Symmetry: C3
């Protein structure tokens, strides 16, 4: 197991927690892999109906941690594995956004089923054009779907944040808790307090039955997207440009 | 014919009216069937270009009326038939929302082409998780399409209303008449007054031509949805849980 | 070359300009064709990454210029060619909306990737029902996608504008410059000033790589749409009604 990311179960809630606020929860390849496996884990567990993903500090995650060298063949394997696990996960994926997210970790927020926000200073940022890359983590599908093509084009092409006012206008954030971003702990605990309230009286196997159908609406497109995003990425690595621009 | 639901024709407008406000226009299986047949009716009638669906009282409809017992094989046959008729209907479907709608009658509001609202206290509610069921009436497709996946997940998974402020933010309501919900009669009559204004000067066969193309965008998905929703539902009935939870 | 529409290149920006404000930039068939060819042009040019489309005066365009007569077989050939060129264009399409757009020129605004507006008095209008026609310029796909089915039905069926407040609520306008619509010149120049700012530091081949993937999400539907819109249109011409209603 891993000291940047913890997890526990709590009735129907399998809870994953990024516990490295000092480093703005930047994640390395093996961290993304681990995160992928925790989902595989919650997904086998027959008592779990909701995978909640929380973080810490002032950022949800600043994304990739930057510290023949086909280290990029791991970078790529990273993308595929973790993106696959989200796309396919059958439990209801909930993300507690305690601050900005960037890069692949931002793409993963966009694959979650429900998102809640600590306050209105949150944003998602996809700096691909800036690092001479293209879309990853299913964003080809996930961004236009959840924010619209024209907004997606404005943000991706010109490396601009999908800010909070955009998130509400498109219903991306299912609720804002409007709390200090000093206290991520209380926000994460407030969310789970309410989740515990909302599930009372429900028949949870219905939720999974319902996700099973809703998921079918785009599952093929999500997978197609993951596949072709990776293929086309290689054209960009072999050119070399991404590397020069890691500085 | 049937004493819970009336209808008349009025130039291009085939008007269907739920006329049972005392019982908050709850509908039984045969009522949904009848409603399905009235659409088949308007759909054959070559003078009709708009099927308007109005109700009465303080509710548009509270949905299913609850009053070897394979009565559920009728419940199921109900869903399939009436959902089919909406999906396939070729006239422009307009719904005059005089108050909340619940359940299948709420799903049918989501299949209508245009919706108008009496005032800002209207809502749609889909209590499937609460009755140990899954999605029905094409909601698998219709909700994410018209409100977005993240909002759909928040409302369905946790049995919460799609309230009015959500409906505007997603353009679901094409106009609010902002009238007392004492007077549904005047609201229904105001809507038809305006509809009569708006059609003047138009070439109505163009409207049907245009719906024919727009409809093609999701017709397969709607049908796939109706089919698999029903199949998967049976897994839930045979378990029994829906029944225990009718109390 | 053509005296109603100019163009120049300026680093990565291929700029097309409708320069006939006196006639509210109404366009004839051969004008739409030319516009189609300018795109084919920018699309071959390997130094170009953005095709910017600007206009002049108080209108972006009032659409079709109205001034055995199978002149309609040219009307139709017009639609197909120019709609094809937009659908398929691989450079990032940006449209600077200096005032209202109508008809096919409005449909082409809806095919652009990004749109900016001079001020909040802009609108798009699709008067097809009014001229006994159906959808053209891919609007069958483009309108519901970018504004939603219910709003699309309200505007098309009843010949009403997609006004500015609707455009923001659906993220259609990626930024409003809030300037006098006296001065279109300054607005067009302000847009290009900012575009020049935003591209600095980026790796432009990433933008085209990203559009290549995003475009794939609906390219088949757009093409299907162009094809069947044309086929079904002929049923309406042969009836004659469009012609009677050109007065």
């Amino acid at each position: 197991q891993n000291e940047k990311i913890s997890y526990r179960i709590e009735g129907p809630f399998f809870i994953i927690h990024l516990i490295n606020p000092d480093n703005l929860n930047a994640l390395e390849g093996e961290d993304y892999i681990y995160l992928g496996e925790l989902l595989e884990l919650a997904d086998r567990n027959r008592d779990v109906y909701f995978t909640i993903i929380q973080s810490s500090g002032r950022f949800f995650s600043s994304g990739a941690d930057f510290k023949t060298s086909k280290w990029v063949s791991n970078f790529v394997a990273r993308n595929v594995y973790v993106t696959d696990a989200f796309i396919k996960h059958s439990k209801v994926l909930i993300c507690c956004l305690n601050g900005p997210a960037i890069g692949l970790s931002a793409a993963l927020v966009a694959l979650c089923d429900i998102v809640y926000s600590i306050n209105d200073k949150v944003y998602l940022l996809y700096p691909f054009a800036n690092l001479g890359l293209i879309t990853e983590g299913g964003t080809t599908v996930s961004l236009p779907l959840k924010f619209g093509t024209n907004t997606t084009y404005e943000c991706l092409m010109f490396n601009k944040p999908f800010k909070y006012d955009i998130m509400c206008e498109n219903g991306f954030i299912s609720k804002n808790f409007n709390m200090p971003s000093s206290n991520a702990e209380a926000f994460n605990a407030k969310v789970l307090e309410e989740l515990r309230e909302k599930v009372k009286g429900l028949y949870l196997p219905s939720c999974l039955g319902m996700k099973k159908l809703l998921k079918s609406n785009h599952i093929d497109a999500f997978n197609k997207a993951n596949s072709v995003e990776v293929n086309e990425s290689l054209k960009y690595w072999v050119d070399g440009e991404p590397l020069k621009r890691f500085r």
